């Protein structure tokens, strides 16, 4: 994921940010400068556009068992594929020769990293002082008022961040300290030595059931990861057992800080050499962590729908036997270990991808149901079920149909972040609405209703994305060019080179009309939504009738409406500079990871999914990493 | 008078209208269309102007006798010059020839001519049904009300045309009844043979004084013409007698018919051949008769302005000897006859050259004051005191100054209408203002002052008006050019330049702002007034800044002020039709003249003033007709 953020600007710039909420919101502000060269006169219009993001989210989480995966055991104790190398085990060392013909070797840690990462991120939220239930916005548009139900009220919502289970309420793991050579049950067992021992306190409590208490989307459901299972440690540790029993009391039984919780991660992933398991539960929580906000009205099915999240169940096979975790490490792919020296080199890689891959996902999603119909794209492939059937590869298709770049794959097979209810472009939402005053909307019964997936943020977190093949202004620049016919009341303009033209004369002050009656643009982000009635079919000629000025207006243009006054407006729009308000600038030459003892593959199998999906010119597809 | 109006807009038009008043004042409407070329982009706005006239003045009357003209006499009778031949007349016939040594022959009937002009002119306005006092318009413009005074007042005075004089009240000349062939005393005598009772009645009569009883500028005051005379007619006529000793009641003795009017001015005219004699009164009559109402403010000083007319004493030797009207009359203008026949063809020729003759003579002083400036004009001419200081020649100069072709003079010498107070340009008036609301105005003490003479009516009456050298909105069309130079709030432009920018796009429907504020242009004549800072020397670029829009707009234009959207506009505008409303053109094929029985002669004499004045390249002068 680190070459996605890198890449969706430039090599240099690798522009990170930290982790911050406002009762379960933020807004990302930038400050952007619009061009307008024509007849050898530059002019130009500086102005700010945010964007804000929600943190608030109820998904759904399936725990469902799948591969075992063993790539952090030494050499010797691996096959030429993931299998381990039992011979190789035995010969090192008995009624466990015998025993072992009914030990399944399932070792997946995927659940209890990302229990750790959503903990992680909430401790930091709640010593950042802003952490409690999170609330939707409340959007107004003098003409509408809606406001999205959520379960937890902020009010009376937590403010510190509790122990996910509760007080014995629950039943808790059976938990056990493991110091021989043999293992006893075929239950698993973790290997914790070189952890503290409140950090071995927080990992063993936190397997146990987790309880979701606010609305945040990191902090959903999920039980036991294990019924039994034992550490292997040098000492026992039992202040969280005097905590279940009821001894120990809150004050000094709490949740570690966030440097401790951190560091208990690095602990684990680089004495368990779970590169990969880790990269895949970065992605997952990245994939699963916010959406953003969206200042028009009907851009709220988005917030209303819920993804679905299939985590693999949790199984151990390191803490089993001493020696697995010596010698030299196998099968780590290079992608997995500089993503993981980059994370902890800095912790918010993951909120400033997972920003990143909110925006990107909604606009592929977006621009998939646009560019079904015709509008930008020549080749009419197959959008709606090539690459998004795939529920592994479905979030990482839709950011290659928006950036173009290769979108990073989970890494790991059966585990994904899906929207079902979305791969239909027949799907409506009911969106809650108080309507103010009527006006042109879809106002049936109370609710509007939407038709696929709808804009709800502006292409600025990633600004250079290539949506479309022909200049747009998705990309830096356009040129607006002259219609195919005027006629007396107007000109007729293709279906893109209509809205180019509307979204520069909404930049430069100016309200656009056309029949077959707004081209809509909100303020505070300035970026003109594609016209519903342009993006079906059928319709390839957009009528421009009347280019009428606003109430304010900032850079003064010919007609282009007009055969006599039309001009070869050229457009150009850098962004400036964007400040987070509830930079961090990481660099690649002091992040590089540790080579030594570890064995580095380039590429990757397409079974377990370790590949990139770009968008081809003649459609998007998987591809490895050779 | 004829070539003038004839060639104002060509030979073949040839318009003439009839005398309309209500409440002393009438307006003249057109329709006019007006083009606006660019870019192979015909555009057309078409739209009515109406320019009112009013027939209230005050004009000073000097009754100073000159020169003796016998210009109607045979052959025989006259010498080389217009001297008589004595030595003829007495070979033809004594103790006359003893008195002749005491006989001035001083014959000069212009005052008697004038009067039975004016007489017929309110005989036709009160058979129309609108004679009555006249009254001033009241002009109110939501921030000025003003209103001028006039002596006689509307509803209480005469609606009908009473006869001059009074009932015996003043004294009456001592008329006689003259058939001998030798004159008794040095007094005048009449030839009214072939003239009917009634004529002879209402010539005698109203040879008697006349009183001022309406505001109308032909109703002046004026003196009995002689206190002693008789007419040579076959009969006595006594009715008038009759009436001035108080026994023919007014009901039958009342001021004759219009037709019986003109018919007694023909008989007398063609029995006389004072053909000569009557185009000099024709022209006085002309240039006394009306003035045009200003559609500005300011522009009422013109009204204010009382003309000074200088008619010559009433003399006749025509009747003294009856064969001096017989045999070929000799030295007769051919430009007189052809005026003569026009008019009595139709008599509204006199009423059209005089509105035109309005017209031409406040945009001719209007444009000598600006012309003095620099503005339109290369050379700095002389024109404060040139051809301005001959009072015979002033009309006419103005005439010239404004229109460009040659304005007919009066044909006569020590005959005009001449404003004294102004030929100075520092000349003020002080016009009454009843201010509404306080603006730009420069508003002294409840008056506002005008320095020289305003523009009060708008080049309509007459269209293709040269006034400059160059193209201009008086000529009928003009290209806006380039600015001399741009810059950020604006571009500069000449005085000339950015005259004709400001009318263009006030007639287009843009307002134009400038700086070193309004171009002032008033609705229901679209005619942009020269800006009163512009038209001072030391100024030769005008800043314009603000080319803005108004309520109504008619045609849409580029910026023209930015040199991005600068274009060439090239405009045209004609004048479509015209109506008066309180045609009839004429034919000149069918009005030729008699040339039987007349001597006529092309050229005439410079001391008589029988010439044109033309504004020549180098400086307008007087011309012969040669």
Chains 1, 2 share one sequence.
């Not at 009656?517 to 009738?545: L, Q, R, S």
Request: net charge negative; glycine share 6%; aromatic share 12%.
């Amino acid at each position: 994921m680190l070459r996605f953020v890198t890449k969706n600007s430039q090599d240099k710039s690798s522009d990170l940010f930290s982790i911050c909420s406002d009762r379960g919101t933020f807004v990302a502000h930038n400050r952007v400068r619009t061009d307008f060269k024509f007849d050898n006169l530059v002019f130009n219009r500086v102005y700010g556009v945010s964007q804000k993001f929600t943190l608030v989210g109820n998904p759904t989480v399936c725990f469902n068992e799948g591969s075992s995966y063993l790539e952090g055991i030494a050499k010797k104790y691996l096959t030429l594929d993931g299998g381990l190398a039992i011979d190789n085990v035995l010969n090192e060392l008995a009624s466990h020769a015998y025993n072992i013909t009914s030990w399944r070797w399932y070792d997946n840690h995927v659940a209890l990293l990302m229990n750790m990462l959503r903990a992680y991120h909430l401790q930091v939220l709640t010593e950042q002082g802003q952490y409690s239930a999170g609330d939707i916005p409340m959007y107004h548009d003098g003409h509408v008022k809606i406001k999205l139900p959520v379960t937890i009220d902020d009010t009376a919502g937590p403010t510190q961040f509790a122990w996910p289970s509760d007080r014995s309420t629950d039943s808790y793991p059976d938990w056990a300290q493991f110091s021989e050579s043999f293992p006893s049950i075929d239950v698993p067992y973790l290997d914790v030595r070189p952890l503290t021992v409140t950090e071995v306190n927080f990992v063993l409590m936190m397997m146990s059931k987790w309880h979701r208490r606010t609305n945040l989307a990191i902090d959903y459901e999920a039980p036991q990861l294990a019924d039994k299972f034992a550490y292997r440690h040098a000492l026992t540790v039992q202040d969280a057992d005097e905590w279940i029993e009821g001894d120990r009391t809150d004050d000094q039984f709490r949740p570690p800080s966030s440097k401790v919780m951190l560091s208990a991660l690095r602990k684990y992933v680089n004495h368990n050499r779970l590169y990969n398991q880790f990269y895949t539960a970065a992605q997952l929580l990245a994939q699963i962590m916010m959406k953003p906000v969206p200042n028009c009205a009907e851009g709220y099915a988005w917030l209303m729908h819920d993804a679905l999240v299939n985590i693999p169940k949790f199984g151990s096979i390191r803490g089993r036997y001493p020696f697995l975790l010596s010698g030299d490490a196998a099968l780590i792919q290079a992608t997995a270990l500089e993503d993981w020296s980059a994370i902890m080199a800095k912790p918010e890689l993951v909120f400033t991808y997972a920003m990143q891959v909110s925006v990107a996902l909604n606009t592929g999603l977006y621009l998939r149901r646009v560019k079904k119909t015709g509008f930008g794209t020549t080749i009419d492939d197959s959008y709606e079920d090539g690459a998004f059937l795939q529920p592994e590869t479905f979030v990482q298709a839709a950011l290659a149909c928006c950036t173009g770049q290769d979108a990073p794959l989970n890494g790991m097979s059966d585990v994904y972040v899906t929207y079902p209810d979305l791969l239909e472009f027949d799907a409506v939402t009911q969106v809650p609405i108080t309507v103010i005053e009527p006006a042109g909307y879809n106002i049936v019964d109370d609710h509007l209703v939407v038709v696929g997936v709808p804009v709800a943020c502006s292409p600025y977190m990633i600004f250079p994305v290539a949506a479309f093949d022909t200049a747009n202004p998705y990309c830096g620049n356009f040129v607006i060019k002259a219609a195919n016919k005027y006629l007396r009341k107007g000109a007729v303009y293709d279906k893109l080179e209509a809205w180019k033209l509307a979204w520069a004369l909404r930049v430069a002050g100016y309200d656009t009309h056309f029949k077959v009656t707004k081209f809509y643009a909100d303020n505070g982000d300035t970026w003109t939504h594609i016209p519903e009635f342009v993006t079906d079919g059928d319709v390839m000629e957009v009528f421009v009738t009347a280019i009428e000025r606003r109430a304010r207006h900032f850079v003064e243009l010919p007609r282009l409406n007009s055969p006599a006054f039309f001009r070869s407006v050229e457009v150009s729009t850098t962004i400036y500079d964007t400040h987070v308000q509830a930079a961090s600038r990481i660099n690649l030459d002091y992040v590089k990871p540790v080579s030594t003892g570890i064995q580095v593959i380039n590429a990757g199998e397409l079974k377990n999914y370790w590949g990139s999906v770009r968008r081809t010119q003649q459609g998007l597809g998987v591809v490895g990493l050779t």
